[PDB]
Amino acid sequence: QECTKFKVSSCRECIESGPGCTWCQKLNFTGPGDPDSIRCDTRPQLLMRGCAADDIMDPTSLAETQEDHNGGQKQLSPQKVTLYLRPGQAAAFNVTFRRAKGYSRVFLDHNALPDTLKVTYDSFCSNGVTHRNQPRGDCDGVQINVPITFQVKVTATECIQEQSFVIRALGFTDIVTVQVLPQCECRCRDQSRDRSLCHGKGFLECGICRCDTGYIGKNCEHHH
Ligand SMILES: *[C@@H]1O[C@H](CO[C@H]2O[C@@H](C)[C@@H](O)[C@@H](O)[C@@H]2O)[C@@H](O[C@@H]2O[C@H](CO)[C@@H](O)[C@H](O)[C@H]2NC(C)=O)[C@H](O)[C@H]1NC(C)=O
Numbered sequence: 001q002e003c004t005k006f007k008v009s010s011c012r013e014c015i016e017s018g019p020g021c022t023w024c025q026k027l028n029f030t031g032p033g034d035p036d037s038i039r040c041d042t043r044p045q046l047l048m049r050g051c052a053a054d055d056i057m058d059p060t061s062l063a064e065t066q067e068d069h070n071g072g073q074k075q076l077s078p079q080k081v082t083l084y085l086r087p088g089q090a091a092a093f094n095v096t097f098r099r100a101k102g103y104s105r106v107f108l109d110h111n112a113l114p115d116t117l118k119v120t121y122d123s124f125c126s127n128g129v130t131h132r133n134q135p136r137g138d139c140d141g142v143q144i145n146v147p148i149t150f151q152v153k154v155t156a157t158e159c160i161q162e163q164s165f166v167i168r169a170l171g172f173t174d175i176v177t178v179q180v181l182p183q184c185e186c187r188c189r190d191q192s193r194d195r196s197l198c199h200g201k202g203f204l205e206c207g208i209c210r211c212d213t214g215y216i217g218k219n220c221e222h223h224h
């Protein structure tokens, strides 16, 4: 992974700087002559400065799938997919096409998407024929009741607004419903179980004390 950042001030800003960026929420991680942006780096760079693995914030793209009770599903499965998309990190899931009759050539495609979403397909066709990273799924000569698999990869270029879209095999009425959601939030430790954090005179936000008015210092220790 790599991480190019510039004077980021928060975990959110860090995570938005690229898919390899991660954030250390460890208390007091910043030395006297360091900006808060030192908390933002690749995972191996943070481990090397002594951030523990569970203090490293790193929201990751995820796919979750659902099948119906499947008296209802025919030729395409799964029927429902939910994607959590961290910008620049593809989420991948497999779609299986299976037909009780002989199928000749199967194309897998999606409806028109906004500029912020990129979709590619790998096609795992019969006879070990495989295509990678194409604009649509494409297999030739499907025998009877033999599944073919398409690997769908979806990447967001920024933190998107939630939306759905569909994937279909051309010539068939089956639908895979794809729900997409952003994956841009850090789930950092908050201060609920310690009134001593930030001297009880600031808010703890992903390892950084945001001091109450009149208080200053990295731990809100100084009063002016
Ligand atoms: C995070 O750092 C704070 C700040 O404490 C300072 O302590 C100095 C001895 C020196 O190392 C300096 O670089 C550092 O920033 C820690 O707070 C201190 O905690 C002690 C008790 O352990 C108190 O007696 C001090 O009053 C208090 N000082 C301040 C300025 O708040 C804090 O413990 C530390 N947190 C963790 C989890 O290590």
Ligand SMILES: *[C@@H]1O[C@H](CO)[C@@H](O[C@@H]2O[C@H](CO)[C@@H](O)[C@H](O)[C@H]2NC(C)=O)[C@H](O)[C@H]1NC(C)=O
Pocket: 092, 093, 094, 124, 130, 149, 151
């Ligand atoms: C979708 O299916 C493909 C093919 O079955 C999976 O690719 C295989 O992944 C394993 C690792 O888990 C490798 O050992 C195999 O060599 C891969 N096969 C091929 C043909 O490349 C892929 O992992 C599946 N994707 C998901 C998200 O489950």
